[PDB]
Amino acid sequence: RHLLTVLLKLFSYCVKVKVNRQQLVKLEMNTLNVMLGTLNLALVAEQESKDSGGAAVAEQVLSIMEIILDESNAKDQLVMLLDQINSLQGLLRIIPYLSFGEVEKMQILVERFKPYCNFDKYDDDKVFLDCFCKIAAGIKNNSNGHQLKDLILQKGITQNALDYMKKHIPILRLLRGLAIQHPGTQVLIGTDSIPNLHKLGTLAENLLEALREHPDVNKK
Numbered sequence: 001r002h003l004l005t006v007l008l009k010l011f012s013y014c015v016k017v018k019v020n021r022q023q024l025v026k027l028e029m030n031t032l033n034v035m036l037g038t039l040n041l042a043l044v045a046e047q048e049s050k051d052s053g054g055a056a057v058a059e060q061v062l063s064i065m066e067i068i069l070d071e072s073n074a075k076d077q078l079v080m081l082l083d084q085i086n087s088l089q090g091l092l093r094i095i096p097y098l099s100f101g102e103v104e105k106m107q108i109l110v111e112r113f114k115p116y117c118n119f120d121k122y123d124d125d126k127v128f129l130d131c132f133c134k135i136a137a138g139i140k141n142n143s144n145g146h147q148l149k150d151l152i153l154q155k156g157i158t159q160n161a162l163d164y165m166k167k168h169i170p171i172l173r174l175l176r177g178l179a180i181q182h183p184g185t186q187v188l189i190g191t192d193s194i195p196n197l198h199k200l201g202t203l204a205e206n207l208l209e210a211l212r213e214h215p216d217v218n219k220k
């Protein structure tokens with residue numbers, strides 16, 4: 001415990017150097033993998049033993065991993081990952097990184113979230129839905145990211161929310177989250193929701209603006 005805390009403090013001090021950030025970002029370091037393994041060990045320690053100090057270590061690991069991911073911006077274990085996730089948002093961001101593997105695990109999480117998609121039931125399930133919206137916001141613009149976006153479109157929960165809103169014309173969170181790098185979703189939104197979206201409501205305006213990145217959508 002003490003050695004781990006000291007090493008964490010040292011790495012925390014070290015990360016504050018952009019040169020150190022670049023040096024660590026070197027793939028030869030494979031730092032992100034080591035960090036993920038350490039985070040998994042810390043998660044095991046915290047879940048098996050709450051108040052064992054693993055929480056602070058996990059927070060430090062999350063901050064460091066976030067810094068490393070920002071610097072980079074310049075799936076079997078994902079089972080246990082989502083399991084721990086059941087018990088902050090940096091974990092949601094990390095989930096896509098581990099999701100750059102077997103799309104079977106991607107569909108596993110897609111289904112795990114699809115359970116909380118009972119719209120009339122929602123209006124734990126709310127917590128899962130909010131987490132799903134946050135992860136949708138966290139959808140990365142990658143090849144596997146776009147593949148998973150197309151897969152989630154095939155999941156049709158988007159169409160489910162579309163039907164729910166259409167019946168409920170007087171929610172947009174995951175819509176705006178998926179509104180990035182999903183031209184098919186842009187077309188689906190602009191097909192008929194353009195009138196109702198225009199009729200509105202701040203979140204609706206924000207989602208409409210996000211979809212307006214699509215040019216034909218902005219035309220409407």
